[PDB]
A paper describes a structure:
Ferritin is the main iron storage protein in most living organisms, playing a key role in iron homeostasis and detoxification. Canonical ferritin is composed of 24 subunits, which self-assemble into a quasi-spherical nanocage with an outer diameter of ~12 nm and an interior diameter of ~8 nm. Ferritin has prominent octahedral 4-3-2 symmetry, and each ferritin molecule contains 24 C3–C4 interfaces, 12 C2 interfaces, 8 C3 interfaces, and 6 C4 interfaces, which provide several potential pathways for metal ions and small organic molecules to diffuse into its inner cavity.
As a further example of the general use of our design strategy, another AfFer mutant named P156FAfFer, where Pro156 was mutated into Phe156, was produced, which can also assemble into both BCT and SC superlattices. Additionally, in their SC crystals, the C4 rotation axes of adjacent P156HAfFer cages are not aligned perfectly, while the P156FAfFer molecules are perfectly aligned.
Residue numbers in the entry:
A (entry chain H), B (entry chain H), C (entry chain J), D (entry chain J), E (entry chain C), F (entry chain C), ...: 3 to 169
The structure:
Amino acid sequence: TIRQNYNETSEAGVNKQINLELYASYTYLSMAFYFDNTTVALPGAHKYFKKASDEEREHAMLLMKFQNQRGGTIVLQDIKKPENDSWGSLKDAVQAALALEKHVNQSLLDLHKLADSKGDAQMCDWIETHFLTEQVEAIKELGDHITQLTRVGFGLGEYTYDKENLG
Amino acid sequence: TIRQNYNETSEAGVNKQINLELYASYTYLSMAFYFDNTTVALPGAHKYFKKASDEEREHAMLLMKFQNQRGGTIVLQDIKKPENDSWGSLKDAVQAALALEKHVNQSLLDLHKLADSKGDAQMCDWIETHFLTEQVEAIKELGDHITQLTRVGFGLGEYTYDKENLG
Amino acid sequence: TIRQNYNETSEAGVNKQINLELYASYTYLSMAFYFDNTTVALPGAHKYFKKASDEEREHAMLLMKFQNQRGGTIVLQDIKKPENDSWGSLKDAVQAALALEKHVNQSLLDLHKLADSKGDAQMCDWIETHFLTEQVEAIKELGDHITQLTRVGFGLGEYTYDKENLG
Amino acid sequence: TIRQNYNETSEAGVNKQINLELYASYTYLSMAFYFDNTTVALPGAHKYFKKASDEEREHAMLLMKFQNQRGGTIVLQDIKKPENDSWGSLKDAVQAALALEKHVNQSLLDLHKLADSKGDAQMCDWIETHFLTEQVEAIKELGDHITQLTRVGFGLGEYTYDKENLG
Amino acid sequence: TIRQNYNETSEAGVNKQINLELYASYTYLSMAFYFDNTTVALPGAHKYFKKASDEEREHAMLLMKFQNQRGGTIVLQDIKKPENDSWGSLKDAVQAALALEKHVNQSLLDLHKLADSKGDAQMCDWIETHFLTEQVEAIKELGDHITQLTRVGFGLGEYTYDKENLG
Amino acid sequence: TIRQNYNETSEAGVNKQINLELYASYTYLSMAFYFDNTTVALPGAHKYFKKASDEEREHAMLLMKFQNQRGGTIVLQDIKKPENDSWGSLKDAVQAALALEKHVNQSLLDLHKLADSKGDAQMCDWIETHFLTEQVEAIKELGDHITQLTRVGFGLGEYTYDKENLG
Amino acid sequence: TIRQNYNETSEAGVNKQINLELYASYTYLSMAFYFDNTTVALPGAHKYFKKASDEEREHAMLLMKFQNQRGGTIVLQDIKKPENDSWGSLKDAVQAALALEKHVNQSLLDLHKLADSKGDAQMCDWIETHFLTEQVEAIKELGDHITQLTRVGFGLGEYTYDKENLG
């Protein structure tokens, strides 16, 4: 019996967060191959979102590794399909991604407000060390990608930011 | 308009196969972290299934890349959760995996019997080149893993095949 | 006598395909040196289409190598001049190449449907291995090039996609 | 005078934790040289527990380094002898270490709950950074070791997990 | 149970094809050491056919690997002795090898025609990938050998082609 | 809009803390060039404080980066001149630096106490990771410098500690 | 307008020479793969004519590059098929080659005599630099090839000069 100072409501939030980080992985993967369809054809975005889809997958496994470390149990659920089939312009996908990370961001803090509420000190710093700080930077990198894609404008500017920056 | 000699029923089978190869990726990922829970604690199996979950993910992207190459359109659906939460013994997971690959195997041939039926010659050899031959070997490697795990027996034999072979 | 299971009508479709792949190599060479004339002045397209003219010449030699391998005999015909002397904008030349590849694609499939009808199993896999999949990638890349040249537009965009992508 | 926001009760819990980490380093050293006696003869456990005794001695020096850093003063007490002279089978020693780590874990958390109560923000993150997560991994690995030593059994299995894993 | 979509009649043709490729490794072996007899003394042909005898042995093992991979059961029969104890001149042996490869070629296509009739798609491409194309090249090279051995003539030319080309 | 869980009062404390770390980079700069004046002539202290002046400048940029990362808005005020034009002896400067670091230390904890009161979890660990622990080490090293500068005494010892330790 | 001192008859004489070299490259290609057919099977001649086929293609692109450098316009006509389908013996192909190079030679001197009548001083030296001297060396090499092939005679001699010289 290795479980020590691990509430069962903190355990259910880890399962909820795992399914969430997998949902992001499955939306980015839609974005990535949306930019691969011949009617879009933005290769840099295809690479950029394909790494991002692989990185949100990393999030879920980390939370699955943590769940096993503390003594809980991984309870998986369905990964719902993304909320669109086409993602519009390059700006429109990045705007969609920002609101996704902001959703995951709030869910992570609520998970941290829950751990601090059950006095789960190790879970708090495990949330700080791996997620809280990484999430702000991703939002900031996204928020800086939107402002740039607005600047360059449609067309040649939309292509140039795909090759040079995301590629 | 790049679409040439690509039936729309061959297109729906690619979508069905993509969701399938993602279902396998999400079952292996359950197996992988099932073997990571402290009540199981078989590290070699955790690595072995974590690569396998990453490899079935490769299957889906390949079929998503193909879908975009021929001119179709990727229509994603929910990835259903695996059919168990605990996977029993190391033999029991490998037996479960074999019946999974055999399920994907039959679905791939049916997809190839469909393409040959619509005279889709390039899709047939794209199924031959990447999936048909790779699927038999995985089944054979699994069928050879079961027979070995039956030989070594429970306990020390179950651990030894985890470290030496899968690890 | 090396000829075995090589129908005589399968042998005529090979010579037809040889004269076809030489017509494409000779069309791209017109495109390549059209983009070299001082009134066009797009070097990346000149390089891009000069390698493609060499590559379709590779297609024909492969088909001539095969004809001799199966015991047939090569029968050359005239290489008709291209359908145009000037090829318009950079988008217009890529749209003509796409229209040309899709014709060669249909004739290869027709040649493959001809091989399977005569039970020429070895000829079928030879067309699978060297052309059918290579030809789908050729169409997908072209259709992606057109999508981008449409995005960047005329003027600076036509020069931009000429230097960075095609060259 | 360097002492700032360092409560005097936070200072006593540090000395208590120092004497605690020295008691663990001295218990593992008993275990390490128990597994070196000719009647046990398990070298991989001897090496494994001799590095752990050095590592808990590292814990205490970290806590002594911290005490001096915050302006406190180190007050040493006696290092009580371990609760046993012999430690039974290989599984029995790993189960005692687990029972020992979980005690040290509770005292670290108690020490952390003591730091947060006195608004000692820097002491809280110092306990987060060096111990809390390192201590969850120590418990998870031990509980995984017990699961395996149970699987392999006695006799050959107790020797096997001693040579390949612990050594 | 790994067997899936592997007809029992397709399994018989593999056992048959194994005994055939073994018959070809034993004929080339006879040819390889006929040219080593002091009354013949063509070392280049002794090297050439010995590699051929080792390569048709490879064929039998590839088919035996496939038989095990598809879940079947390898059934061996007698390897009949070659049809000649002496093989005449260098042209006469290469002409004999050409008639041998063409017999194996017809039995492979009949095996492939048997695989295609039972809908065994994987077996078909497996025969395509490893045999149908390799066999036509082996025949084409033997027919060219016969054409070149007829050009140089008997005597000196029969020695020259042995040293320079076969060796 | 990237701002999330970033109270407006927490934003004011960052602007304040930026102006503070700028005040510390401008005081150490005064100290660094006081020790360069010919009537002082302590080069090791001129090197030591110049690195300190560059390092507190780093602090201000880290806080300005964080202000932009969290979506806030950097507001700059005057950087007030230091409290002295001459800094006395080497002990007197290190004693002055210790009182400076302790002022910054208290304002950081008050900033952290402000971040904790608004539930700003990310800001708290961001202050933990980059400041709270770095600040206690800076203070501990200054107090040890004062203790060592008191041991060696004025004159020769005041020169020895400058060359060997600070330089 | 870059055109300067470039007559319009010299321009039509460059377009005629382009179609001539292209007819020469398409004849050598017929010769090369004629020597690849199994009833001929002369590998050294296949390689030799494939380089000469590729070499005469280079003549055509040099002239097209020249046509573009002088301000003109490339006008392409049909490349007529070679005058034979089978080329006889290796002596017979080199004799036909020599006659073809002598024809291109006179057409180049006629084009140099056409440029010298229009006072086109740069077109003269451009023909001298790239063609006139290369062509005489090509004619001297073919006539040298014809004298040797007659020396070695038919049969074994025709093979040896194929392997050793043309290979």
